[PDB]
Amino acid sequence: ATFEIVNRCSYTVWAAASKGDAALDAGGRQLNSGESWTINVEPGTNGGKIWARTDCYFDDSGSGICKTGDCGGLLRCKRFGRPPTTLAEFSLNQYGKDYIDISNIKGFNVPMDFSPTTRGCRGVRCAADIVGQCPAKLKAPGGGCNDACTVFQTSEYCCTTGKCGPTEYSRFFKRLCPDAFSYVLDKPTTVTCPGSSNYRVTFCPTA
User: Which Cys residues form disulphide pairs?
Assistant: First the structure.
């Protein structure tokens, strides 16, 4: 499956794609304002994620650091990135179908649209100004808006015991972005697409 990753933001981002234990495709690449990078993700990929990283420096071997989304200091990500990271999440060819969603469970750094380029389902979007409206105690000094598990490390925010409910913090994400996961047990906003669909992830989809 192809995922076209498009940076409409006015600033550079370093796209990242991983299923947690491995890169997807090259795993990472710089996208200047306007650039598009198309990756190929193996069918049957379960638990894939694509995200943006901001204010990165890499040296000539592709080692450095990002202020959001850093995946162990590599340009080419093999693991998930350091919150805060808006997440495009997908599992492909799961008993005949694809599942996609955007999640704020690991915070928000960059607005995002996650849409199929092929027929038979709809896309999802979290494009509100969550960084600018971010509650005081969630603001990440490094840039972006942390989820409350990251900040406070409690069973309630992290949903460790599998029994959490919504919170004042999760409700901020859900109000700004109703169509993205705001906490682990949020009512699902997952979209079912045909097996083997193709996709576009657009950073900053709106002015």
Answer: 9-204, 56-66, 71-77, 121-193, 126-177, 134-145, 149-158, 159-164
State the resolution, in angstroms.
Answer: 2.3
DSSP 167-180: -HHHHHHHHH-TTS
Other CB atoms within 10 Å distance of the CB of residue 96: 8
Give the number of domains in the chain. Answer: 1
Amino acid at position 110, single letter: V
Provide the CATH number for the domain around residue 34: 2.60.110.10
C-alpha span between 188 and 174 (Å, rounded): 12
* Contact of 164 with 176, CB cutoff 8 Å: no
- How would you write 103-124 as a 3-class SS string? ECCCCECCCEEEEECCCCCCCE
Angle at alpha carbon of residue 174, lines to 168 and 179, rounded to 5°: 165
Domain that holds residue 166: 1-207
Phi, psi of 18, rounded to the nearest 5 degrees? -160, 155
Contact in structure between 147 and 83 (CB atoms under 8 Å): yes
**How far is CA 37 from each of CA 4, 53, 63, 120, 149, rounded to the nearest angstrom?**
6, 14, 20, 24, 32
Cα-based torsion angle of the residue sequence 134, 149, 181, 52 in order, rounded to the nearest 10 degrees: 70
How was this one solved?
Answer: X-ray
